[PDB]
Design a protein around this ligand. Structure first.
Ligand SMILES: *[C@@H]1O[C@H](CO)[C@@H](O[C@@H]2O[C@H](CO)[C@@H](O)[C@H](O)[C@H]2NC(C)=O)[C@H](O[C@@H]2O[C@@H](C)[C@@H](O)[C@@H](O)[C@@H]2O)[C@H]1NC(C)=O
Ligand SMILES: *[C@@H]1O[C@H](CO)[C@@H](O[C@@H]2O[C@H](CO)[C@@H](O)[C@H](O)[C@H]2NC(C)=O)[C@H](O[C@@H]2O[C@@H](C)[C@@H](O)[C@@H](O)[C@@H]2O)[C@H]1NC(C)=O
Ligand SMILES: *[C@@H]1O[C@H](CO)[C@@H](O[C@@H]2O[C@H](CO)[C@@H](O)[C@H](O)[C@H]2NC(C)=O)[C@H](O[C@@H]2O[C@@H](C)[C@@H](O)[C@@H](O)[C@@H]2O)[C@H]1NC(C)=O
Ligand SMILES: *[C@@H]1O[C@H](CO)[C@@H](O[C@@H]2O[C@H](CO)[C@@H](O)[C@H](O)[C@H]2NC(C)=O)[C@H](O[C@@H]2O[C@@H](C)[C@@H](O)[C@@H](O)[C@@H]2O)[C@H]1NC(C)=O
Ligand SMILES: *[C@@H]1O[C@H](CO)[C@@H](O[C@@H]2O[C@H](CO)[C@@H](O)[C@H](O)[C@H]2NC(C)=O)[C@H](O)[C@H]1NC(C)=O
Ligand SMILES: *[C@H]1O[C@H](CO)[C@@H](O)[C@H](O[C@@H]2O[C@@H](C)[C@@H](O)[C@@H](O)[C@@H]2O)[C@H]1NC(C)=O
Lengths: 4, 640, 642, 4
């Protein structure tokens, strides 16, 4: 997961 | 966003804005870390009454009560059940929609921030900030907390947004290395597409490697990130009158005038703290740093040494995407670097001046960011991704006033009401708003159609082909999809590649998942589905070729159906990808009146070895309509 | 000056501003290091055509051409002959009226700066900046260069200003330790006075020692510096919820939230770099500094060590005059200092938060005499009380050259600006000069002596708490030798009811009484008068001073002062008397009847003894009106004159 | 001299  | 909307050509006179009323009657949901409500970007000055259709709640919580909403921020909701279920022993500090990270606030303002007078990023990019859709209603849905971020909360957040009747969904998050039936945003997005809600998501920031993107699903608008035509300057003036407009983002009006400059190969590397500490009067001296591939380390060493300033020689694309500039200095290109070095070597008492907080409005533009994730989609190769290009590099938007923003020196942190931020996170919300407005001008258009308009009308040129920042060559559809969003045109595409909820079910059906995996995605919008079909009516084309052996001539046929949203007739213009031939049939489409549908078949004959690009454009004969679709060949890579 | 005019009560609706059209039709001359023309403060957005009376030039020079003037900056002239004569070998980098220092630009804008939208000192004192007289005309006369400042040049600047037809003169410079006939500013001031031009001059910044002021001449309006009600905030919040509004001028929006605070006596002194260098994680920790009398040194040691911030315990007045705050932090008084130190000792994990760029306009009491403002009596001439009046001088926001050092962050970063905070009597004088000009516009016939009268007898000796203005240095009541008649009150000065007027001849007669040699005499009066057969030391002044030798035995003394008051209002006034401690005073008549410009005299008499400067006053209150003509009275030792 |  990763918030962009 | 003090310039972004101008860069897109949006204005009150004509185009999407006037036709959409700046999206006053439309609602865009933002799924992120929450929002900071008191921001100026979220006030409701020129806002009419809230559409009666809306019934979303303003859920109370920590430092957030049911009066925090208005005619702008019409909804605030959060979802933390996943967190607590995971560990009920946890004390969630900010148990509400209030943003304690910033990501959520920045995105919300970009998509529909209200006009905000006299703001800037520490002097840079000054002006009035506003969302790509200044009058769109905001519906916040916080699923990301400091204490954690859970998939189930994400899905719960989307489901609620769709249930609330939102018009569009904006989500700047992504997951990699998982199959569709384990992909959170994809599962929820499928449900959204099933109910007429278009989802705009970032492609990710792990470019430029091949197939590095996420959210690459057929039922998602996958958005890439490009540079604008804005630049920030520390004008460099040498003692000999030589004036060079370099790059700088030092967050303050530093005063470096007629200061001594030195060029010394023993420390030119700017990697040794000990060496740099040997320069006498380091506080009144400007040191020159060679291009060594690690600019951010040089800046660290410089800042720690407390030099007056430094002239960094570099063309590393990373430098032009970061706002980290805690010490006065300038970045110059290789040519300029030689001029500066020469001046210094041919002079005793070489001096320099540098001013800051300067912002200018660059060629070429736009340009695909080197870190913007690339296709093809390892979630599904069949459909080209990403879909479209939008501004995402160093964009100005609202930000929580009580969190770290940037830095000065090694010990001084600074906060701000508006900050510059880069990534696909900034780009997606631009597309979300544009889509929201297109939906306002055409209340009957489907998510697929709206995406069609945005794509077939996108601009592949910057008047040359948009470049890839990583290599400086022409950008591919796997880099920028159809190209740069062009809102005003999107309003009148002439022809759209439409699709229905049933079409996607048919597509999902063809993937041949177990009926359990199928239900996981469905999940209650369709049952396990007797007309499987992998040829989804998509406004783009991708021809795939295996690399597991000898390469031989391959052929692929695509079936498309274009509906007329304009009586009219189009002729197909073809540019076939390199080392391949293409053909269409029929070569001419005739329309007797609005809403009439017409089908055709594109056929590519290609051989692999390397992603080649071409296109098909339906140009109206008695008008100015031009419907363009990109074509790209690609190897078959490891899928998740 | 984003608040100063509000602090003075000036406004467009009523008072001096409307009565004088914001001084649009008057002209004030600024004698200093020049000006930065392209400043927003010197543009002419709301300026009517230049008064035809004016014919001053826009003299060309280095980076300055004859088109650099407008309907706001109507005159520009520089004087360097003194520097060249002294050495022709000198290369004058900026050979024109352009300001390369800042002093001149700051004063200019304070006196007659045009309205300038959205300015500040790095976020502090934000708002619209404007001079005390927003529409007054500017005439710049530069006599101060980076290469040198010369008396003769100064005198040449004034003479030229007076000759140009200037209505008022403002000069923020002062010389000490020289007799009148060697006092450049005074010599020229006499000439200016002789021709009906008032000169506002700073009192000096070498207070609070007795008789430390300069420009203390009878023919000069000597100005002292006071604090305003404005304060700059670094709100301090402890982990326990305790919130304190401390002092801070860090020139940026620093982010220090929930950081660990430490109090370690071994270093609480904040005077050792070695010790402070021993605090682990100095970049995320906040150290508390004890009061050691040298805050500015502490700040330096802290800035060198790179602490995230420091809480300074200090009540030293010098701290509240300086904009030097290169590192995040706050200053707190003795009591608050204990509250903070306590919290830390009674806790493991004591944290704190400090915000910045906060300005508040509520301080009490205000104004207050700056501890550094020069004090009377004038060692140029004990005969007349100095200074004359008080005006805003502490941390005033005004225009500034964009290309010179303004303030600092960390040890290596210098910052520049278009508007900066600056302190001193230099900032005060221009306030007076501007007001003096508007009075002159409202009453074109009033003399320089009358206009100074309206400002003095109408001044306010009480602060915003309605108590007697305090002396920052001691916290006791300020004396006339500290603040003259008191704090300027423009709107009242517009309508003083009565005035202590005077004429050129009156100053000649006063000059003669000084009993100089006739060459010395001519040195001062040059050609405005000739060596004068009616000496008179009793100049008709709007204030009184009673001097007493301190050599030998003290014995009940007696002094009589004769005054003439002309009615600028039919009315009658009654004299109210407050006699200086340990002394008696009486007037006569005790009432004054007026039929309609009519003049009427009276005599004040004081019986006092020396030991110490005691203060009293005499106010003529109108019976059938609301006029009040007040004049300070002060006793003073006879100290060494220059 | 002194510029105040
Ligand atoms: C979650 O918040 C609770 C307070 O609302 C914490 O429990 C309380 O902690 C206080 C200060 O540590 C203590 O005075 C209270 O008696 C205690 N109990 C209650 C019912 O509030 C809790 O802290 C944890 O549990 C407590 C009981 C202590 O053992 C702490 O050391 C624990 O950290 C908070 N939980 C966490 C993980 O912080
Ligand atoms: C280029 O950078 C070098 C590293 O700072 C300089 O040499 C350093 O000079 C210091 C005294 O100025 C001395 O303490 C250091 O030991 C020495 N460092 C090294 C790695 O040798 C150099 O200065 C020149 O060379 C030194 C050795 C002295 O001879 C100086 O007089 C020379 O200027 C810097 N500049 C040049 C032109 O070399
Ligand atoms: C005052 O300005 C003069 C002219 O700009 C300087 O003289 C000139 O200096 C130049 C650089 O040194 C040189 O190229 C010129 O030939 C020289 N002479 C002329 C007529 O231009 C002068 O500099 C001083 O005198 C010169 C001749 C040198 O010997 C220097 O050592 C001196 O600084 C300037 N004077 C000063 C005090 O700076
Ligand atoms: C109060 O300040 C003292 C002086 O800075 C601290 O002692 C210093 O501690 C350093 C490492 O913490 C050590 O390298 C220095 O030699 C030493 N300096 C002196 C003058 O003693 C002191 O820290 C405590 O005492 C020292 C000696 C160590 O034992 C530390 O572990 C202790 O914390 C400071 N007192 C505190 C932090 O409570
Ligand atoms: C007098 O000085 C002014 C101030 O600049 C000159 O006007 C400027 O000319 C420069 C050319 O380098 C332009 O960049 C500025 O925009 C001009 N500004 C204004 C206000 O005119 C003017 O040319 C000078 N006059 C002469 C005769 O040299
Ligand atoms: C909640 O919102 C804000 C943020 O805390 C509060 O200030 C409000 O306080 C309540 O309402 C305001 C308008 C004021 O009357 C105050 O006295 C009240 O306590 C609160 N608003 C509501 C509707 O509860």
């Amino acid at each position: 997961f990763e918030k962009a | 966003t003090t310039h972004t909307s101008d860069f897109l050509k949006l204005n009150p006179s004509s185009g999407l804005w006037p036709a959409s009323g700046l999206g006053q009657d439309v609602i865009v949901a933002v799924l992120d870390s929450g929002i900071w409500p008191e921001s100026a970007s979220f006030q409701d000055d020129g806002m009419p009454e809230i559409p009666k259709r809306w019934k979303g709640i303003c859920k109370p919580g920590t430092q957030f009560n049911a009066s925090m909403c208005n005619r702008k921020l019409i909804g605030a909701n959060y979802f933390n059940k996943g967190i607590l279920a995971n560990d009920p022993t946890v004390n969630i500090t900010m148990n509400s929609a209030r943003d304690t990270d910033g990501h959520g606030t920045h995105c919300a303002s970009i998509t529909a921030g209200n006009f905000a007078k006299g703001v800037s990023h520490f002097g840079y990019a000054p002006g009035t900030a506003r969302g790509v859709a200044p009058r769109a209603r905001l519906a916040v849905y916080k699923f990301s907390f400091n204490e954690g971020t859970f998939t189930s909360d994400l899905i719960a957040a989307m489901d609620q947004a769709v249930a609330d009747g939102v018009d569009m969904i904006s989500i700047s998050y992504g997951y990699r290395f998982i199959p569709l039936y384990e992909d959170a945003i994809s599962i929820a997005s499928f449900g959204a597409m099933m109910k007429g809600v278009l989802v705009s998501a970032s492609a990710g920031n792990r470019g430029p490697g091949i197939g590095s993107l996420n959210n690459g699903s057929p039922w998602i608008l996958c958005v890439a990130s490009g540079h604008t035509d804005r630049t920030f300057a520390g004008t460099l003036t040498l003692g000999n009158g030589l004036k060079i407009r370099g790059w700088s983002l030092f967050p303050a009006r530093a005063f470096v005038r007629d200061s001594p400059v030195i060029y010394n190969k023993t420390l030119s590397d700017c990697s040794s703290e000990e060496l740099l500490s040997q320069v006498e009067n380091p506080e009144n001296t400007i040191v020159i740093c060679d291009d060594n591939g690690d600019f951010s380390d040089q800046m660290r060493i410089i800042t720690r040494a407390r030099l007056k300033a430094a002239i960094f020689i570099s063309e590393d694309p990373g430098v032009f995407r970061s706002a980290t500039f805690p010490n006065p200095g300038v970045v110059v290109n290789k040519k300029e670097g030689k001029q500066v070095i020469n001046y210094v070597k041919n002079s005793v008492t070489p001096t320099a001046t540098i001013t800051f907080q300067e912002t200018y409005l660059t060629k070429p533009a736009p340009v695909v960011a080197a870190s913007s994730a690339r296709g093809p989609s390892r979630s599904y190769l069949g459909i080209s991704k990403p879909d479209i290009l939008a501004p995402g590099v160093l964009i100005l938007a609202a930000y929580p006033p009580n969190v770290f923003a940037t830095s000065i020196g090694t010990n001084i942190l600074l906060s701000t009401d508006y900050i510059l931020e880069s990534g696909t996170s900034m780009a997606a919300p631009h597309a979300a708003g544009i889509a929201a407005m297109l939906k306002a001008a055409h209340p009957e258009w489907s998510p697929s159609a709206i995406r069609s308009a945005m794509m077939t009308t996108a601009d592949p040129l910057d008047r040359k082909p948009i470049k890839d920042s990583d290599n400086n060559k022409a950008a591919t559809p796997l880099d920028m999809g159809a190209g740069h969003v062009d809102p005003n045109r999107a309003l009148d595409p002439g022809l759209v590649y439409d699709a229905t909820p049933q079409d996607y079910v048919n597509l999902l059906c063809s993937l041949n998942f177990t009926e359990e995996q199928f239900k996981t995605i469905a999940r209650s919008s369709a049952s396990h589905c007797s007309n499987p079909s992998a040829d989804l009516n998509y406004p783009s084309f991708i021809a795939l070729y295996s690399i597991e052996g000898n390469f031989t001539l391959l052929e692929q046929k695509f079936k498309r159906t274009v509906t007329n949203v304009g009586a009219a007739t189009y002729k197909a213009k073809l540019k076939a990808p390199k080392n391949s031939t293409i053909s269409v049939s029929p070569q001419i489409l005739v329309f007797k009146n609005k809403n009439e549908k017409q089908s055709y078949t594109l056929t590519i004959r290609y051989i692999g070895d390397s992603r080649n690009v071409g296109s098909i454009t339906w140009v109206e004969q008695n008008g100015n309509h031009s419907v363009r679709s990109p074509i790209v060949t690609s190897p078959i890579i490891e899928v998740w």
